[PDB]
């Protein structure tokens, strides 16, 4: 009748964050 | 600014989930309180029973009814919402 | 090093959560894999269906079968285990 | 029979503000 | 008198950063204190936690939350302001 | 050839920052690239998130997790390394 699945999640800090480099010229 | 990381859910229910989260995001600040609002709203509109996990660092292994799972980011916070019987 | 924040489950069920969780940490390092290791075992020791959350910063609002809820701290990591 | 439950993390990372000044030029 | 070199933030927040920096330059002389004024106010008006670097010769590699980064020239000094944590 | 100006991190981790900095200076010449090398290496050995500022003229005001901050001179350059977020 009703179908159930297993599922797993993990948080990655990256998804909402970006790396940035800056150099004074 | 919503990114769906994993989902097994109707696009309308998916859109509903993010909309429900945004409002929960507007009014409440404690992850437990954010989660409570979400679980309650989804328990009425769609039948019980739902569970909601809100945080920035957590790992999960759950069992959910099919077409009733979504794991997504709104800003920097992850929202896990699913239905298990 | 187990401190239970809140619980509605039997004392052996209280204790069993700690043993499987402590052991799982010895074997695994990623929170998702820790949760999978424990949740599978708790499907066996008491029958399905169980759910497990492993992390250090998260809030949850869940609905559980009565006498089947636990949320506790182990070291720096919180483990939420319940049956639905 | 179902009961509801709420959990929140109380883990606290200690935070410090730090200022530095470099004048080698 | 402000040249914005790179940004991932709202224009409303962009102008606020430049306005806040101008005020810091009016009151303070040491780059460390200029940076402190901006970071503290940006912790108040917008949520913690912010970090600020002010100088004429430095290189940086940081990780910032999305929509919360700005690098701009004000006066003779380069100002780096972003939120991480 | 490092002078530790200020530090809140393990004497063992302090040496790694200095050791990693020596290698970063050997491999790269541009301050931005030196900073990138340090932040990445410290992201692997110790968990994210790290930030590094490399330069000779700058002021900074940052917020760091305790026992994860170091500020030192290496060669002709000052290096700021800290962990937040």
Which residues, in sequence order, are CB contacts of E79 under 8 Å at separation 6+?
E17, E21, E35, E38, E52, E53, E54, E70, E71, E72, E73
Of E24, E30, E28, give the one whose Cα is nearest residue E81: E24
Q: In the structure encoding, which two tokens stand for residue E68, read together? A: 């919360």
Rg for chain E (alpha carbons), in Å?
A: 11
Q: Helix crossing, E11-27 with E31-45: angle to 10°?
A: 140
Q: In the structure encoding, which two tokens stand for residue B19, read together? A: 């909309």
Pairing of strands B50-65, A17-23: unpaired
Separation CA E49–CA E47 (nearest Å): 6
Closest Cβ opposite residue B36 in set C53, C54, C61: C61
Angle made by CA atoms B19, E68, E61, in degrees to the nearest 5: 135
Between the two ends of chain D, the Cα-to-Cα distance in Å is 72
Separation CA B33–CA B25 (nearest Å): 10
Burial class (CB within 10 angstroms; exposed 0-12, middle 13-18, buried 19+) of E44: exposed
B54 DSSP assignment: E
Q: Determine contact, residues A3/B65, Cβ cutoff 8 Å.
A: yes
Q: What are residue C58's DSSP bridge partners?
A: B55
Cα dihedral: C78, C82, C84, D1 (round 10): -130
Of C49, C21, C19, give the one whose Cα is nearest residue C37: C21
Q: In the structure encoding, which two tokens stand for residue A8, read together? A: 């797993």
Which residues, in sequence order, are CB contacts of C11 under 8 Å at separation 6+?
none
Angle made by CA atoms F59, F21, F31, in degrees to the nearest 5: 50
F39 DSSP assignment: H
Searching chain D, which residue's CA lies closest to the CA of residue B85? Answer: D2
> With an 8 Å Cβ cutoff, are E61 and A20 in contact?
yes
Residue written as tokens 């990693």?
F20
- In order, the DSSP letters of A1-25 are ---EEEEEEE--SSTTEEEEEEE--
> With an 8 Å Cβ cutoff, are B31 and D6 in contact?
no
Q: How many CB atoms lie within 10 A of CB C68?
A: 20
Separation CA F78–CA F4 (nearest Å): 10
Of E56, E61, E6, E82, give the one whose Cα is nearest residue A21: E61
Separation CA B57–CA D4 (nearest Å): 23
Q: Determine contact, residues B34/B25, Cβ cutoff 8 Å.
A: yes
> With an 8 Å Cβ cutoff, are D18 and F57 in contact?
no
Count structural domains, chain C: 1
E46 DSSP assignment: S
Q: Determine contact, residues A12/E58, Cβ cutoff 8 Å.
A: no
Burial class (CB within 10 angstroms; exposed 0-12, middle 13-18, buried 19+) of E12: exposed
Chain D residues 1-25 with CB within 8 Å of chain B: 2, 6-9
Of C68, C53, C62, D5, give the one whose Cα is nearest residue B38: C62
Which element (helix H / strand E) includes F75? none
Q: Which residues of C25-64 are buried (b: 16+ CB within 10 A; e: fewer)?
A: beebeebbbbbbbbbbbbbeeeeebbbbbbbbbbbbbbbb
Q: In the structure encoding, which two tokens stand for residue E76, read together? A: 């003779």
Angle made by CA atoms C28, C29, C31, in degrees to the nearest 5: 100
Searching chain C, which residue's CA lies closest to the CA of residue A10? Answer: C32
Q: Determine contact, residues B72/B4, Cβ cutoff 8 Å.
A: yes
Q: In this structure, what are the phi and psi dihedrals at residue D14, rounded to the nearest 5 degrees?
A: -80, 140
Rg for chain F (alpha carbons), in Å?
A: 11
Q: In the structure encoding, which two tokens stand for residue E33, read together? A: 């204190």
Q: How many angstroms separate the CA of residue A20 from the nearest CA in chain B?
A: 17
- In order, the DSSP letters of D1-25 are -EEEEEEE------EEEEEEEEE--
Q: Does E68 touch chain F (CB under 8 A)?
A: no
Q: In this structure, what are the phi and psi dihedrals at residue C27, rounded to the nearest 5 degrees?
A: -90, -30
For E70, the domain range is 1-85
Burial class (CB within 10 angstroms; exposed 0-12, middle 13-18, buried 19+) of B44: exposed
Of C12, D25, E30, give the one whose Cα is nearest residue A24: D25
Which residues, in sequence order, are CB contacts of E37 under 8 Å at separation 6+?
E20, E23, E24, E27, E28
Q: In this structure, what are the phi and psi dihedrals at residue F61, rounded to the nearest 5 degrees?
A: -135, 110
Q: In this structure, what are the phi and psi dihedrals at residue A3, rounded to the nearest 5 degrees?
A: -105, 125
- In order, the DSSP letters of C15-82 are HHHHHHHHHHHHH--SHHHHHHHHHHHHHHHS-S-EEEEEEEEEEEEEEEETTEEEEEEETTEEEEEE
E16: left (phi over 0), alpha (psi -120 to 50) or beta: alpha
Separation CA E27–CA E40 (nearest Å): 15
> With an 8 Å Cβ cutoff, are C8 and D6 in contact?
no
C14 DSSP assignment: H
Chosen from C59, C71, C78, C81 to mutate, greatest number of chain B CBs within 10 A: C59
Separation CA E49–CA E39 (nearest Å): 8
């Amino acid at each position: 009748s009703t179908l159930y699945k297993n599922a797993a999640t993990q948080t990655e800090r990256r998804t909402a964050t970006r790396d940035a480099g800056t150099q004074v010229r | 600014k919503a990114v769906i990381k994993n989902a097994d859910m109707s696009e309308e229910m998916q859109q509903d989930a993010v909309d429900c989260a945004t409002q929960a995001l507007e009014k409440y600040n404690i992850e437990k309180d954010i989660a409570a609002y979400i679980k309650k709203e989804f328990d009425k509109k769609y039948n019980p029973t739902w569970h909601c996990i809100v945080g920035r660092n957590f790992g999960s292994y759950v069992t959910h009814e099919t077409r009733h799972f979504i794991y997504f980011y709104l800003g920097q916070v992850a929202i896990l919402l699913f239905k298990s019987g």
